């Protein structure tokens, strides 16, 4: 996916 949407999944 997009970058920002991707780091959100990891942090959560």
């Amino acid at each position, epitope marked *: *996916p*997009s*970058k*920002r*949407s991707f*780091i*959100e*999944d990891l*942090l*959560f």
Partner: antibody
Amino acid sequence: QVQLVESGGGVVQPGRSLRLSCAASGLTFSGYAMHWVRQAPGKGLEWVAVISRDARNKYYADSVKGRFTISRDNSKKTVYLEMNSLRVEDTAVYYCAILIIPGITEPGSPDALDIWGQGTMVSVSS
Amino acid sequence: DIQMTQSPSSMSASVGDRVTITCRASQDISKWLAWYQQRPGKAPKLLIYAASSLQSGVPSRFSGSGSGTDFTLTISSLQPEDFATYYCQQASSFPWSITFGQGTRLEIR
């Protein structure tokens, strides 16, 4: 453009409950997490709660734990906040916002989106 | 309960002056600090993130520095639109908490 609008604000007696809603438009609501931040009159900002894009992980501030519940519906591009057992100190302007996450560099990034709604006033008084 | 100590609480300066606002974290937040601007009766505006990056649209006179616990937002020659209240945020603990500074009021001298 991208716009977040808050609705459902008003007055509520202490001890009772009240539900907030925030409608998002102009971008993929499922591609970003949502936050609630309040601001008491004359005071600073205070982050309240966050919902992930998949609506599975919830986190609340310690002051509102056990009282506030946050939900979302990607089909309506809306994020909700059900506030229960409200107190006078909860009186603030509640902003529905999409905040900047870490790990983002390169100043002109399209993934550094950080915009706020105009906010709604919730008055807890008796 | 990550705390951000902002200083000064209030500031006064004239148009064309240079001012510095500092933010102090209670623990190592790396470079994940952001600077916000808020005008009376309006929602906050993001100015700086990653402690040095400029959000799209903000003029060059807004600059930030710092890593770890001490951070510094420096504004070059001021403009009338620049006189407002500023806050610093941290995103190191992004999932479970985001905290703000108490704020600095920039008053026109």
